[PDB]
Structure 1
Amino acid sequence: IETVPVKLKPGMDGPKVKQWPLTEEKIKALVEICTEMEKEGKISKIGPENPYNTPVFAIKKKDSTKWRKLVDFRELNKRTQDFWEVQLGIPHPAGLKKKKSVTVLDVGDAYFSVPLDEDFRKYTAFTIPSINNETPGIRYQYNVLPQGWKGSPAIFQSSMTKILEPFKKQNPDIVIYQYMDDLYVGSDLEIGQHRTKIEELRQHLLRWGLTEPPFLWMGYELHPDKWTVQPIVLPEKDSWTVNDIQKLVGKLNWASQIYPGIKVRQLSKLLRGTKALTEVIPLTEEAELELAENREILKEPVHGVYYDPSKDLIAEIQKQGQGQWTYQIYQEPFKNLKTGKYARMRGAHTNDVKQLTEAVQKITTESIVIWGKTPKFKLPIQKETWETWWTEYWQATWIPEWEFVNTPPLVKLWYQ
């Protein structure tokens, strides 16, 4: 009921980020949403003495038909002070990624019940553009904690801890983790029981609410205990061609950068001479042993891999074709913290960019569950193509950072 003071980081002004072009349907959706938000006191019109801006657009959440406003507060979040006053930071729960089922709830609607510091409101300014700039864009700022702003869960945390208290005490084995507008709820129950607990959980928020959230009813189900990883595997063959052995030596040479003890001497010796690529080469005993020893090395964990919470996570993605995508998450090169592969890219069989956008969201979700922050993506796409289309397929309430890769990596061959 009383506001928490907020400031920007020393020597920084507010965000001044251009609104990107919006389609007619998204503008109309935003005009309706913001008209209601204004009637409810959540936002207010602003005048020309506020020069700040943050981009806004609209999405449809997964399995819903109603438009959701999404503000891209990435710039404001970078510029906003850090929040360690009451707590140094909420230790990320290592048990969340170990639960049989995790359901993600959209609790962002809760933030609108808390007023925002009057002196900070100007920095949340945003614009609803008009088609062809024919009318002045509609300018608003927030009066309440905004969805997507890193300060909202931090300021709401004391309220959240009290709302959830009876449920946690009543269910001591449930793991509950908040990230931005998301609540991640993990348990080891049979799914039917699990959903009932999730539905039990919704009622606490609803009961609290009335003392109606548009997307609280929804539920994104995950199963992190079944999440799958990608060790390095070598072919098992009866007939090795010159080409096969060259590819193997290439892959082993690459793996030698990650694992020590990798040898290719005996395998390369097989290719002595100047041979046809399609010629079949019988493996010698020495080459078979060296291969077997390499296989044994690749079954072991990478040495000296640790997570440092002070460093960025980096995610690389490769297009493998036929709807398949590989990815790696690391902080230091050759020190992967997780690797993975998708082929299940939903409703996007003829759209590369929709597939990549869904891959980006899935990887970010995995990274939030495991480490409690989002990675910086290295995307195999031209900037202009990505920036034209990704908002059409985005369904999450957060947005990670990304950069673009313009030269094809050899590494695609080694994760293939």
Structure 2
Amino acid sequence: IETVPVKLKPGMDGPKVKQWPLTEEKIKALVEICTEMEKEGKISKIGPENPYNTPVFAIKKKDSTKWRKLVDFRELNKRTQDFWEVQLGIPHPAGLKKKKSVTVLDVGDAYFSVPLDEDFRKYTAFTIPSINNETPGIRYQYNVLPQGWKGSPAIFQSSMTKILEPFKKQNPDIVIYQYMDDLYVGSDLEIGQHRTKIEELRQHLLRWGLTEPPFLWMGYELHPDKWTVQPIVLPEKDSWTVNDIQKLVGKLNWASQIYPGIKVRQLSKLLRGTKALTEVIPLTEEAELELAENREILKEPVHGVYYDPSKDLIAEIQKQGQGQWTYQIYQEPFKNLKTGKYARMRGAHTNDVKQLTEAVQKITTESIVIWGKTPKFKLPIQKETWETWWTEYWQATWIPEWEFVNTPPLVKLWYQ
């Protein structure tokens, strides 16, 4: 009921990002949504004295049938102060990634019950564009905590802790983490009781809501205890061709950047002469011994690998074909914090970009659970292809950063 004072970072003005073009159905969806929000007092029309802008579009969450307003606050979030006045920062729950079931709740509608600092509202300006610029764009700003803004969960945390206090004491083994508009609720119980342990929460904040949230009903369920990784594996063969040994030596040489004692000279010594690529080469016992020792090395963890919260996380993705994708998360090169692989690209058998878009969201979700922040992606795609299509398949309420890779890396072979 009292507004918390919020200001931008020193020497920075509000965001001035161009609205990108929207299809007719997203425009009309945004008109319907924003008309109701204006009636409910959440937003207000603004005049031409407001020069700031933040892009807006519309999505449909996973198996939901009605549109959700999504604002790309990435620039405003970069320009907003970081909130340490009450809390030095919530220590990320390292136990969340260890629970066998984690449900993600869209508690973003709860932020609309808290007013926004009136001096900061001008910076949340957004524009519903018109087709072909045949009418002026509908200009709004927020009067309450907006979804997608990093300051919304920081300010509302005062409240949120008190809402779930009856639940946290009733259930002291449940790990609850809040990231932006998401609430991650982890437990080790039985599946049937897990839902049972989700609706109870849900019914709480609907009880604080009547003293209706348009997306609180839904639960995106994960199982981080069964999150599989990707160690480095070498082939097991009875017949090695020249080509097989060349690929093996090339892979072991790349792993030697990660591991300490990798060795390839016995294997390379078999490649003595100028032999046909398909010719079978018997392994000497020095070569098999060397291969066996490299195999043992690759089963241990990597040396000197630690997460530093003061540094960015970086996610690389490789297209492997046949609907398969590999990814590695790291902070310094060759110090992977997590590696993985996806053949589970849903409803996109004929669409590369939809698959990549679902993989990005999948990797971001894992990154939030593990470290409590999103990585910067290096995407194997042209900027012009990605920026044309990714909003068509986006179903998350956050948006990470990304850059584009235009030169094919050799590293695809080593995770293949």
Query: For this structure pair, what is the TM-score category when the shorter chain's length is used for normalisation?
Result: over 0.9
Aligned equivalents of 2:130, 2:150: Cα separation in 1: 28
Distance 2:247 2:197 in 1: 51
Aligned match of 1:282: 282
Q: CA deviation at 1:43?
A: 0.1
Instruction: Name the counterpart of 1:302.
Output: 302
What SS does the aligned partner of 2:362 have? helix
Q: CA–CA distance in 1 between the matches of 2:271 and 2:295?
A: 20
SS at match of 2:414: helix
- Give the deviation of 1:355 after TM superposition: 0.1
1:158-196 Cα offsets, whole Å, 9 max, x none, are 100000100000000000000000000000011100110
Cα distance in 2 for residues equivalent to 1:63 and 1:176: 24
1:51 equivalent to 2:51? Answer yes
Shift of 1:26: 0.1
- How far did 1:239 drift? 0.4
Secondary structure of the residue aligned to 2:413 is helix
SS at match of 1:26: helix
Distance of 1:9 and 1:205 partners within structure 2: 33
Structure 1, residues 134-164: CA drift from partner, whole Å, max 9, x if none? 0000000000000000000000001000001
Deviations 1:95-144 (A, max 9, x none): 00000000000000000000000000000000000000000000000000
User: In structure 1, what is the Cα distance between the partners aligned to 2:335 and 2:175?
Assistant: 29
**How many Å apart are 1:378 and its aligned residue?**
0.1
Residue 144 in structure 1 maps to residue 150 in structure 2: no
Q: 1:408: Cα distance to partner?
A: 0.2
Report deviation, 1:15. 0.1
Q: Distance in 2 between matches of 1:174 and 1:390?
A: 35
User: Could you list the per-position Cα deviations for residues 264-294 of structure 1 after superposition, in whole angstroms to 9, with x for gaps in the alignment?
Assistant: 0000000100000000000010000000000
2-structure distance, mates of 1:95, 1:250: 38
For 2:152 and 2:271, locate their aligned partners in 1 and report how far apart those are by CA, in whole Å. 62
**In structure 1, distance between residues paired with 2:241 and 2:13:** 63
Find the counterpart in structure 1 of residue 120 from structure 2: 120
**Distance in 2 between residues matched to 1:326 and 1:344, nearest whole Å:** 11
**1:395 Cα deviation (Å)?**
0.1
* Post-superposition offset of 1:364: 0.1
Tell me how far apart the structure 2 counterparts of residues 266 and 198 of structure 1 sit (CA, whole Å).
Answer: 58
Deviations 1:377-402 (A, max 9, x none): 00000000000000000000000000
Shift of the alpha carbon at 1:225? 0.1
SS at match of 1:184: strand
- Map Cα deviations across residues 59-107 of structure 1 (whole Å, 9 max, x no partner): 0001101000000000000000010000000000000000000000000
Q: Kindly state the Cα deviation for residue 328 of structure 1 after the two structures are TM-superposed.
A: 0.1
TM-score with structure 1 length normalisation?
1.00
Partner residue, 1:7: 7
Q: How many residues align?
A: 416
Q: Distance in 2 between matches of 1:70 and 1:334?
A: 36
In 2: Cα distance, 1:201 partner to 1:189 partner: 16
Partner of 1:380: 380
SS in 1 for 2:406: coil
For residues 119 and 289 of structure 1, the distance between their equivalents in structure 2, rounded to whole angstroms, comes to 71
Matching residue of 1:232:
232
In 2, Cα distance between equivalents of 1:158 and 1:120 = 19
* Alpha-carbon distance in 2 for matches of 1:160, 1:309: 24
Separation (CA, whole Å) in 2 of partners of 1:399 and 1:48: 28
Mapped to 2, the partners of 1:344 and 1:209 lie a distance apart of: 37
> Distance between the aligned counterparts of 2:309 and 2:378, measured in 1?
20
Given the two structures, how large is their TM-score scaled by the length of structure 2?
Answer: 1.00
Q: CA deviation at 1:348?
A: 0.2
Whole-Å separation in 2 of the counterparts to 1:388 and 1:355: 15
- The Cα shift of 1:403 comes to 0.0
Mapped to 1, the partners of 2:381 and 2:104 lie a distance apart of 29
Distance, in Å, in 1 between the alignment partners of 2:333 and 2:306 is 12
Distance 1:320 1:130 in 2: 40
Separation in 1 of the partners of 2:110 and 2:216? 9
1:341 equivalent in structure 2: 341
Deviation at 1:411, TM superposition (A): 0.3
Question: Which residue does 2:261 correspond to in 1?
Answer: 261
Query: Gapped runs of 5+ residues in structure 1?
Result: none
Residue deviations 1:303-324, cap 9 Å, x none? Answer: 0000000000000000000000
Identity, in percent, stands at 100
CA distance in 2, matches of 1:153, 1:147: 9
Shift of 1:336: 0.1
SS at match of 1:115: coil
- Root-mean-square deviation (CA, aligned residues, Å) is 0.3
Output one character per residue of 1:334-388: Cα deviation in whole Å (capped at 9) or x when no partner. 0000000000100000000000000000000000000000000000000000000
Distance 2:165 2:83 in 1: 22
